[PDB]
Design a protein around this nucleic acid. Sequence first.
RNA 1: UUAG
RNA 2: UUAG
Lengths: 461, 133
Amino acid sequence: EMVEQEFNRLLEATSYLSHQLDFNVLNNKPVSLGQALEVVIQLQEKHVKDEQIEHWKKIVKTQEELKELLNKMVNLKEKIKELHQQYKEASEVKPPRDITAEFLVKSKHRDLTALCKEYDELAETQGKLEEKLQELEANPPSDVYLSSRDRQILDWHFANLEFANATPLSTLSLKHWDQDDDFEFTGSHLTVRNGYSCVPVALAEGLDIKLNTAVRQVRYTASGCEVIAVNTRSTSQTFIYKCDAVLCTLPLGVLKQQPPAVQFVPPLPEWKTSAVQRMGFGNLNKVVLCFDRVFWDPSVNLFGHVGSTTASRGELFLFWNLYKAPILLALVAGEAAGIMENISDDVIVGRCLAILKGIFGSSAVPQPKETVVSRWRADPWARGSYSYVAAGSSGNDYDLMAQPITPGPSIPGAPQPIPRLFFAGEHTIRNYPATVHGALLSGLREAGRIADQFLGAMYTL
Amino acid sequence: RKPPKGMFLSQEDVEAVSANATAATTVLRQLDMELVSVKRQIQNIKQTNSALKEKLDGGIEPYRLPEVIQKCNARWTTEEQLLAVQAIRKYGRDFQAISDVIGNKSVVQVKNFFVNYRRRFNIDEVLQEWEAE
RNA sequence: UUAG
RNA sequence: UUAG
Ligand SMILES: Cc1cc2nc3c(=O)[nH]c(=O)nc-3n(C[C@H](O)[C@H](O)[C@H](O)COP(=O)(O)OP(=O)(O)OC[C@H]3O[C@@H](n4cnc5c(N)ncnc54)[C@H](O)[C@@H]3O)c2cc1C
């Protein structure tokens, strides 16, 4: 609770840093959420030290008050030692004595009395300062901003945030990464207990779908389009699909691929390509662990694992169990997701069991039956997981992604009113990116725009 | 429009930490040094103060005297008149002091005495000689 | 090559 | 699909 609270407080701090101090540029480069977070954290460590220093500086000021006092009390103890002796000597002059001698006794007496209670006033002040010092020395301020154990648990909340955005926090745009928070849906988050694929399969019913057909080139012209595709099972076999319009649903990762996996003819305009470069395409992976026995708490839908280091904070930081079956589903996020793809399944499953043995006991963890490891960045039909608002980008790039292309005329001096190349998919919808419902809505949008443009919109008259 | 509670972010400090790649590290170890400079200063003064307190051991108890009580009296004896004139020569116009010497004359009677014995005791030129010290 |  |  303590760290999750500080985590949320640190995020608020970055927002303040962004909106109130215009800390959105630095060295002619945009600031990332990661940069701002380190800055905030560094200033929290600076403040902890500024308070420590202020506290010790009040002690010395108090101690130097005491030293000046003790010095006066010593030089006063001596004046009193001397005046006492002078008084005794004057008192030893036995009476009867003349009045100059009686005066001396009386005079030195109150001189001695005057000083004897200056010393008492000071010894009073002494006790005060000494006590004021035991208080300070008893109430030191905070020692560190974060213990090594704190940072580690904080890194887990960062990993969970890197997981949600499918990217390292150093890639996210400080200004814009949270633009679509306002459009969040109400209600509790849910999962599909019979598999999310039941949806696309259901949608596929009644449609003409050519599977194992990899588009290689998209030609869009004043007179129509032709799409060149090959059989993925034998890439020599070629097909030419001719049409009035093309709806491009290719993932942003594919569109980013250099050299191109899909060539556009003529080449896409710079305002389109520039947007494709600026937008981020993140990555995140999962490990499926199939056992014959449940050895975990079935009532717990999910539990975490804190990384030893900041670097490995995304490495298998979270585990799912939300299916009536002996399956654990481990999550890999942030910088880990990318690096873990260059690691064999054996090693990966190994680290999973290691972590689990350390939590449920080195004996209660059997070797799994089935295992599966996603590698979405390596998947050539995806080249990543989903889009994120990269530093240097904005919400407007999502709109540019959605703008259709109108090729110029073939015949010199002819009019070219209609478009031919349309774009949909998760990366094309400004208010609901990186989601299934966002992909869904992008589809409905272009279907309506294409129909508006080719069938005509009668409802606007 | 304000940082979260207990969160500290000034225009001044952000520009300092972001001045470069190690501007952060620099600032934080300058304070680590200043934190050491003062920590040992305190250890030093603790030792110095410990020593001084050691000297005052016993304090002034061996120098305290019974404070004899005697209550005021209206009449001025020749003895008391003479104590007063001397008290004036030494203390100037500290009436409280002069009263503490004589022992049985209130602070007011001292000022009365100043006026009453105006010239019989040449009180003015006595005070002059005091101011000359 | 948005073949002319 | 020698797209209609
Ligand atoms: C690990 C992971 C977890 C996710 N979890 C969630 C979640 O919990 N909640 C949520 O709302 N969203 C989640 N998403 C996002 C969601 O899955 C996607 O945003 C959505 O499914 C994308 O729909 P799309 O049609 O835009 O893209 P796609 O589903 O990728 O459709 C593009 C199609 O084009 C194919 N293709 C690619 N290249 C070619 C080519 N040359 N020729 C022909 N076909 C090609 C691809 O194979 C693919 O079938 C997750 C994504 C990933 C990667």
